Swiss-Prot record, chain C:
Localization: Cytoplasm; Nucleus
Quaternary structure (record): Belongs to the 40S cdc5-associated complex (or cwf complex), a spliceosome sub-complex reminiscent of a late-stage spliceosome composed of the U2, U5 and U6 snRNAs and at least brr2, cdc5, cwf2/prp3, cwf3/syf1, cwf4/syf3, cwf5/ecm2, spp42/cwf6, cwf7/spf27, cwf8, cwf9, cwf10, cwf11, cwf12, prp45/cwf13, cwf14, cwf15, cwf16, cwf17, cwf18, cwf19, cwf20, cwf21, cwf22, cwf23, cwf24, cwf25, cwf26, cyp7/cwf27, cwf28, cwf29/ist3, lea1, msl1, prp5/cwf1, prp10, prp12/sap130, prp17, prp22, sap61, sap62, sap114, sap145, slu7, smb1, smd1, smd3, smf1, smg1 and syf2.
Family to which this protein belongs: Belongs to the TRAFAC class translation factor GTPase superfamily. Classic translation factor GTPase family. EF-G/EF-2 subfamily.
Domain of life the protein comes from: Eukaryota
Annotated function: Component of the U5 snRNP complex required for pre-mRNA splicing. Binds GTP.
Full protein: residues contained: 67 to 99 of 984
Protein's name in the database: Pre-mRNA-splicing factor cwf10
Organism in which the protein naturally occurs: Schizosaccharomyces pombe (strain 972 / ATCC 24843)
Swiss-Prot record, chain D:
Sequence similarity: Belongs to the CEF1 family.
Subcellular location: Nucleus
Main function: Involved in mRNA splicing and cell cycle control.
Top-rank lineage group of the source organism: Eukaryota
First-to-last residue of the parent protein present: 203 to 277 of 757
Organism: Schizosaccharomyces pombe (strain 972 / ATCC 24843) (Fission yeast)
Subunit relationships: Belongs to the 40S cdc5-associated complex (or cwf complex), a spliceosome sub-complex reminiscent of a late-stage spliceosome composed of the U2, U5 and U6 snRNAs and at least brr2, cdc5, cwf2/prp3, cwf3/syf1, cwf4/syf3, cwf5/ecm2, spp42/cwf6, cwf7/spf27, cwf8, cwf9, cwf10, cwf11, cwf12, prp45/cwf13, cwf14, cwf15, cwf16, cwf17, cwf18, cwf19, cwf20, cwf21, cwf22, cwf23, cwf24, cwf25, cwf26, cyp7/cwf27, cwf28, cwf29/ist3, lea1, msl1, prp5/cwf1, prp10, prp12/sap130, prp17, prp22, sap61, sap62, sap114, sap145, slu7, smb1, smd1, smd3, smf1, smg1 and syf2. Interacts with sde2.
Stretches that traverse the bilayer: none
Phylogenetic lineage: Eukaryota, Fungi, Dikarya, Ascomycota, Taphrinomycotina
Name the record gives this protein: Pre-mRNA-splicing factor cdc5
Signal sequence coordinates: none
UniProtKB/Swiss-Prot annotation, chain E:
Organism expressing this protein natively: Schizosaccharomyces pombe (strain 972 / ATCC 24843)
Family according to the record: Belongs to the SNW family.
Source species taxonomy: Eukaryota, Fungi, Dikarya, Ascomycota, Taphrinomycotina
Gene that this polypeptide is encoded by: prp45
Subcellular localization(s) per the UniProt record: Nucleus
Protein name per UniProt: Pre-mRNA-processing protein 45
Part of the full-length chain shown: 82 to 152 of 557
Job description of the protein: Involved in pre-mRNA splicing.
Subunit structure: Homodimer. Interacts with cyp1 and the small 23 kDa subunit of the splicing factor U2AF (u2af23).
Curated annotation (Swiss-Prot), chain F:
Signal peptide positions (record): none
Family in the record: Belongs to the CWC15 family.
Protein location: Nucleus
Subunit structure: Belongs to the 40S cdc5-associated complex (or cwf complex), a spliceosome sub-complex reminiscent of a late-stage spliceosome composed of the U2, U5 and U6 snRNAs and at least brr2, cdc5, cwf2/prp3, cwf3/syf1, cwf4/syf3, cwf5/ecm2, spp42/cwf6, cwf7/spf27, cwf8, cwf9, cwf10, cwf11, cwf12, prp45/cwf13, cwf14, cwf15, cwf16, cwf17, cwf18, cwf19, cwf20, cwf21, cwf22, cwf23, cwf24, cwf25, cwf26, cyp7/cwf27, cwf28, cwf29/ist3, lea1, msl1, prp5/cwf1, prp10, prp12/sap130, prp17, prp22, sap61, sap62, sap114, sap145, slu7, smb1, smd1, smd3, smf1, smg1 and syf2.
Organism, as annotated: Schizosaccharomyces pombe (strain 972 / ATCC 24843)
Role of this protein: Involved in pre-mRNA splicing.
Source species, domain of life: Eukaryota
Protein name stated in the entry: Pre-mRNA-splicing factor cwf15
Classification of source organism: Eukaryota, Fungi, Dikarya, Ascomycota, Taphrinomycotina
Length: 391, 120, 33, 75, 71, 44, 96, 240
């Protein structure tokens, strides 16, 4: 038909004249597609808006990671005779207590690892400890359905909290009020008064075991994640739920609060998500930990730790969501290969030492390498602008 | 060549039709149902041509701020064909869905065992 | 060439052989308070 | 009932809700964007009469099978 | 004419120029419909939600802490 | 009602002055203390 | 209490029962089975016909019995993650 | 008395194992055989209260509502189901199929718009294309193709748009779509098969200076490390 000819410039003037460097590698070259017919009144604006959304997303996933220095093993404490399930650190950062599957709570010295007295009195495995920062107490809970309040001035149980239809899997203390919150297998989180041992609130909204817990001072105060892969945000004043977070696919076994940022992060078998707290606004993913995460801990200087059920240990850059170190937990000599696992973890008060309670009957202490030198200790390489996340 | 082209299309489709996931299974069931559809009756063309002539404002196909799509009550023929298609599909499902042992359950268990361990 | 008696048999490496020389291995079987 | 009956009534035990006075737990479908309106109120007669024909069909089929015992007595 | 509202109010022309808003089924109940997350924008990180400027990631000061503590 | 539900331990105990209250922990320098303690342990 | 129970009723529902040295084993078994159910529900990926918990529980019970009788317990068709989890829980039970 | 007996047996069977969905399905079926409405919905939605994520129950409920010609009820049920589980395509596919085969296409168009707000996979967009092309109306299907390529930047979608464009009928439009595609994919995405398809379109249009020149451009564009198929197509055109 040869209505026009000489495509030599067209086949070049179209491809060449634009931004040379790719913006999102899928830019439709806004100025180049008006010329086609169609529905520019409605379809064109929708396409433009979708392009704006996608370019904003791909550009906002490109935060440069920091360095943060790597971690290393410094001490292996092996005193327990069962799986170590929980750990908490005393506010003065002198000693820490770890309950385990041998029915015992062992209190160790944080600096030296020397074993102080061993506390007995649970019928079954201990699943949660909490050293009160305003009282000289130590609350504990176990799969044997009762909650205890050890008086640390006499090392004897004084209070018992009884209402629970099955095992208790987590325990937390309100930072301001003298109120503690426990969560267990009966798909109910219960709120206890410390002094009177009364069950004021029965936060009953889930359908299965409330595997995770978190308590703070501003509303919503209680955050509970269960086996329904759903997180709930409760208000303690009325004992009702405000928001429900169903983004997770499998049970969320780890909830953790940022000390300084008013956001929280939760982990599950698929993905680790962190949220803006007042309304539960999603704020991004921590992808790369393809395992069953059990623990999440955030340092003071924006470092995240995530321990898996198979000994996988990943350290995350909180700001950029970049996994800057992969560590594989190694079992103590008597264990099996399948015995590698992590159940509980916590940074100390300073945040320079990380305490890990393993599925190996051992407690391990991790310390950042002191020499530093970002030139000689590079993080995991960061490869920007590969492709937009599916979401 | 046209007959050969139609044989090419047949053979092409034959090698894609030879359970993977629910995600793709939904699509395959839907496009089978589309393959069994008979659209383009005398209704649609009349609806396109009639009320478009007096389009003083807003188009019959505009749905950015259309209001009438809430109140579309179909006719008897369409609902009838709905019911017959559903019944035929149900009947099709029920049609396609259907001594080492002491009882019929033991038999089914032994056949399961045979399915899993005979390789080993 | 030497034989290993059953009571002398070792199945697992020492914690030093498995953790390196820059980790202190603590075995706190007994209480200190 | 064949010759002369005192209208025998079946016996219920003393501690059952009977499942025959109302819906056992009485939950209604949530109302949505599209108004049902007529879809049930235009055809309350249908809600009663489809029920009626199904009863009557059950009665006919039971009667035919009861006489079918004699009908298929020898085959 | 005596029909009342036998059905939910139709979708709304939201103030963000969004043509039609089907979130009314999800927000039906919960007594907290303003916080029910039922749209694809809720799958997107707040870092990249388009119509967001500065998001304040700091705790609600001390007056809010005291008020909520007292309540 | 039940024997174990009777009133008991009606006085809640708070951390006293030298027991490590929040004020002192905020005033204290935990970092250099921790490193000094670790070095003291190492010396043995 | 006697008069309250007389004029009110049992109020049996919604009451807890402490473990009393006779329910110790039957409660430990329940907790172990619940934990194994959770692990099964997690390690199995999405859309892989999750209705497979009971058979893995049977495998776990048979593995425990084999351990007690000192029998190797090699199952040919078992996937590696399931086998590893069963071994781990059997070792936990054996140590207890 | 017969419904009372069956009702009591099914009610205990579902109270004992409240997680047995088969019992609820069987109860709904048996109740549906005579008393077609009201309490059937009650029992079914009770089961959804037990577990609302059981897709077979949702589908069974839909089919049972449609057997008795209750259409608007089923449309409300779909709205609840799709706002509850937006990321399962079985419910969306059943919805669009039903609405499409009712004859109401003004509503299934907006239903598809709702589904497209979630950016589904390419299968949903292709279903929308096939829907629109089933009633011609290609003027807005071209725009829908634009949405498909902007949401899903891949060479395959651009070839699909070119095929639709040539089916509708134009020459400047198709090559113009191809120019938009080249300037969108850029150096790092444009593979040889794209230029092969453009060359084949040009040969079918019997404009051969264009075709030979795009062959030279493709020769010099991609590295000679991966140049086999483009070279052989160049040979086929020039010798043919």
């Amino acid at each position: 038909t040869v209505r026009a000819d000489s495509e030599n410039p067209s086949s070049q003037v179209i491809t060449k004249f634009s931004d040379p460097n790719k913006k999102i590698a899928g830019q439709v070259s806004m100025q180049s597609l008006e010329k086609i017919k169609g529905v520019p009144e409605a379809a064109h604006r929708i396409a433009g808006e979708s392009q704006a959304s996608l370019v904003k997303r791909t550009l906002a996933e490109q935060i440069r990671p920091e360095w943060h220095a790597p971690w290393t093993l410094m001490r292996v404490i092996s005193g327990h005779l069962g799986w170590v399930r929980c750990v908490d650190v005393e506010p003065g950062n002198q000693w820490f207590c770890t309950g385990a599957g041998d029915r015992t709570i062992k209190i160790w010295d944080l600096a030296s690892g020397v074993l102080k007295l061993t506390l007995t009195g649970h019928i079954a495995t201990v699943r949660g400890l909490a050293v009160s920062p305003r009282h000289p107490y130590l609350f504990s809970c176990g799969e044997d359905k009762m909650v205890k309040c050890w008086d640390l001035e006499t090392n004897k149980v004084i209070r018992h909290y009884h209402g629970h239809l099955s095992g208790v899997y987590a325990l937390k203390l309100h930072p301001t009020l003298d109120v503690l919150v426990t969560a267990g297998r009966d798909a109910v989180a219960r709120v206890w008064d410390m002094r009177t041992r009364q069950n004021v609130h029965v936060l009953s909204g889930h359908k299965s075991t409330v595997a995770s817990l978190a308590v703070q001072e501003f509303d919503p105060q209680v955050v509970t994640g269960s086996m329904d892969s759903t997180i709930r945000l409760w208000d303690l004043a009325a004992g009702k739920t405000l928001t429900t977070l169903t983004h997770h696919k499998k049970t969320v076994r780890a909830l953790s609060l940022h000390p300084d940022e008013f956001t929280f992060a939760s982990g599950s078998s698929d993905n680790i998500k962190h949220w803006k707290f007042p309304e539960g606004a999603f704020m991004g993913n921590f992808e790369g930990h393809n395992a069953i995460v059990n623990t999440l801990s955030i340092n003071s200087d924006n470092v995240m730790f995530s321990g898996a059920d198979n000994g996988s240990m990943c350290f995350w850059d909180w700001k950029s969501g970049h996994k800057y170190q992969e560590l594989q937990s190694v079992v103590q000599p008597g264990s099996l290969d399948s015995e590698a696992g992590i159940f509980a973890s916590s940074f100390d008060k300073t945040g320079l030492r990380l305490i890990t309670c393993e599925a190996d009957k051992s407690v391990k202490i991790y310390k950042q390498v002191d020499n530093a030198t970002p030139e000689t200790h590079p993080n995991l390489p960061w490869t920007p602008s590969n492709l937009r996340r599916r979401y | 060549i046209e007959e050969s082209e139609k044989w090419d299309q047949r053979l092409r489709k034959k090698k894609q039709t030879i359970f993977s996931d629910y995600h793709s299974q939904a699509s395959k069931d839907y496009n089978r149902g589309i393959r069994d559809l008979k659209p383009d009756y005398e209704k649609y063309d009349k609806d396109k041509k009639e009320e478009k002539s007096k389009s003083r404002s807003v188009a019959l196909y505009d749905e950015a701020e259309r209001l009438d799509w809430v109140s579309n009550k179909p006719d008897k023929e369409h609902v009838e064909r709905l019911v017959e298609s559903i019944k035929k599909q149900d009947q099709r499902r029920l049609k396609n869905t259907k001594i080492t042992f002491i009882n019929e359950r033991n038999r089914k268990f032994n056949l399961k065992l045979q399915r899993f361990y005979s390789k080993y | 060439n030497a034989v290993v008696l059953h009571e002398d048999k070792q199945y697992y490496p020492s914690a030093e052989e498995v953790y390196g020389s820059n980790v202190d291995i603590m075995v706190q079987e007994q209480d200190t308070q | 009932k064949a010759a002369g009956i005192n209208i025998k009534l079946f016996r219920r035990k003393k501690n059952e809700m009977d499942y025959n006075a109302s819906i056992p737990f009485e939950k209604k479908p949530a109302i949505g964007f599209y108004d049902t309106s007529e879809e049930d109120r235009q055809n309350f007669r249908e809600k009663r009469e489809a029920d009626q024909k199904i009863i009557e069909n059950g009665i006919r089929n039971n009667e035919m099978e009861s006489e079918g015992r004699k009908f298929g007595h020898f085959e | 004419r005596s029909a009342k509202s036998a059905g939910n109010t139709l979708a709304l022309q939201v103030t963000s120029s969004g043509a039609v808003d089907y979130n009314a089924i999800a927000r039906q109940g919960h007594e907290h419909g303003e916080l029910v997350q039922a749209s694809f924008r809720d799958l997107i990180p707040l870092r990249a939600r388009l119509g967001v400027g500065e998001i304040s990631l700091e705790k609600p000061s001390d007056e809010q802490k005291q008020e909520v503590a007292n309540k | 009602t039940s024997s174990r539900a009777l009133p008991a331990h009606l006085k809640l105990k708070y951390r006293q002055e030298s027991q490590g209250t929040e004020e002192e922990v905020r005033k204290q320098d935990l970092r250099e203390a921790l490193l000094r303690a670790e070095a003291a342990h190492f010396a043995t | 209490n006697l008069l309250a129970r007389q004029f009110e009723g049992r109020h049996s529902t919604g009451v807890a029962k402490q473990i009393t040295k006779q329910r110790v084993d039957s409660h430990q078994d329940l907790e172990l089975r619940a934990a194994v159910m959770n692990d099964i529900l997690d390690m199995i990926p999405e859309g892989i016909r999750q209705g497979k918990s009971k058979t893995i529980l049977q495998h776990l019970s048979e593995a425990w019995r084999c351990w007690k009788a000192n029998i190797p317990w090699k199952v040919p068709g078992l996937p590696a993650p399931i086998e590893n989890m069963i071994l781990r829980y059997v070792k936990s039970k054996a140590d207890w | 008395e017969f419904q009372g007996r069956k009702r009591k047996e099914f009610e205990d069977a579902i109270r004992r194992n409240r997680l047995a969905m088969g019992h609820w399905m069987r109860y709904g079926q048996w109740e549906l055989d005579q008393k077609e409405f009201a309490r059937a919905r009650s029992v079914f939605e009770r089961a959804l209260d037990v577990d609302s994520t059981y897709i077979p129950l949702w589908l069974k409920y839909i089919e049972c509502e449609m057997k008795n010609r209750n259409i608007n009820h089923a449309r409300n049920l779909f709205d609840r189901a799709v706002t509850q589980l937006p990321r399962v395509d079985k419910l969306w596919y059943k919805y669009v199929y039903m609405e499409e085969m009712l004859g109401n296409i003004t509503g299934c168009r907006q239903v598809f718009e709702r589904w497209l707000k979630w950016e589904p996979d390419e299968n949903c967009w292709m279903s929308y294309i096939r829907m629109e092309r089933r009633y011609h109306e290609n003027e807005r299907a071209r725009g829908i193709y634009e949405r498909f390529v902007v949401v899903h930047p891949e060479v395959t979608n651009w070839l699909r748009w070119a095929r639709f464009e040539e089916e509708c009928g134009n020459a400047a439009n198709v090559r113009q779509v191809y120019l938009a595609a080249i300037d969108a994919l850029g150096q790092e995405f444009l593979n040889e098969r794209f230029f092969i398809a453009f060359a084949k379109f040009e040969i079918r249009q019997k404009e051969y200076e264009r075709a030979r020149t795009i062959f030279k451009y493709a020769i010099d564009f991609m590295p000679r490390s991966k140049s086999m198929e483009l070279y052989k197509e160049y040979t086929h055109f020039e010798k043919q």
